[PDB]
């Protein structure tokens, strides 16, 4: 833990939300809405399954994209190469090795989520510590935007507490 | 455990949101209440698809009106009304087995008269956004309650 005065001169405290190759624009939009709500960076790792001009990314009566700290990466490789030295990345999977709620999040952690249809590839999962959102019911996975919100807000709870 | 709260959607408008919520309800093993009128037919393929193959595992309750919902509310039961204008943070609540979590329609949220009736909870949004997506808000609220009750 940092000294109190060091913490003071650090910014509002924040994690990075990262979508690996999102396919469905409504999912990306519903994640962006969460990112802008928290004031946290949203990283989109191409290829995306949609054009950024898609009418499906917004909603009438809503405007959040102008307030999204959007980061675009051309590939997963380029994303990794762009990480600061010592970056901590948590890969989210319903087959994850530890519970989300066991994790102790820190400033500038990266929370990494897969596409709705397939999730993160096994090689990516094997590369990072993996976190599971518990599902006591007979369900294989949650909707992407829901999983991002549950994870992001648990980190928010931890950080602001 | 096991643990059980109730998830309640007041006049949900978009079938994809209701199906996503059904998926979350099935994942937690919690009943899902819908209060009519809905913005979609219950026969909707988009609704069904949004819940994938999980609808068989959803304890689905339908109410013809808000009044009907209230009459189905056991004496002493607690309701939390979720609102972006809510009075207390989600994380200040201490949830209990059997609590009802109430959410409003995507396009306008819960009526003022409904907000006035129950304690209101806000999911913090320090950034400039007016509100979260309905299914995301339900997930965030439901899983904070799950975290509290499972002791982690
Ligand atoms: C296959 S669902 C799309 C993405 O949502 C995330 N996700 C969905 N459900 C869960 C869950 N129970 N636990 C952890 N991550 C999840 C995962 O990052 C997945 O790649
Ligand atoms: C108007 S968005 C649809 C519903 O989502 C819920 N909701 C969306 N964002 C929040 C938020 N920050 N806090 C509490 N509830 C929210 C509210 O119940 C609302 O009626």
Q: Would you kindly provide a written description of the structure presented here, covering whatever features stand out?
A:
Chain B: Belongs to the class IV-like SAM-binding methyltransferase superfamily. RNA methyltransferase TrmH family. TrmL subfamily. Chain B: One of its GO terms (molecular function) is tRNA (cytidine(34)-2'-O)-methyltransferase activity. The structure is a homodimer. With about 160 residues, chain A is an alpha/beta fold. The first copy, chain A, has a single domain, classed as SPOUT methyltransferase, trefoil knot domain (Alpha/beta knot). The first copy, chain A, contains 5 helices and 7 strands. Chain A has a 7-stranded parallel β-sheet. In chain A, β1 (about 15-20), α2 and β2 (about 40-45) form a beta-alpha-beta unit. In chain A, α2 (about 25-40) packs parallel to α5 (about 145-160). The longest helix of chain A has 17 residues, at about 145-160. The interface of A and B includes residues 33, 40, 99, 139 and 143 of A. The site of one 5'-deoxy-5'-methylthioadenosine has 16 residues of chain A, from α5.
Looking at the overall shape, the CATH architecture of chain A is 3-Layer(aba) Sandwich
Please give the oligomerization state of what you see: homodimer
- Ligands, deduplicated: 5'-deoxy-5'-methylthioadenosine
Number of domains of chain A: 1
Structural class of chain A: alpha/beta
Protein chains sharing the most extensive interface: A-B, 40 and 39 residues
What's the gyration radius of chain A in Å?
A: 16 Å
- Helix count from the secondary structure assignment of chain A: 5
The CATH homologous superfamily of chain A is called: SPOUT methyltransferase, trefoil knot domain
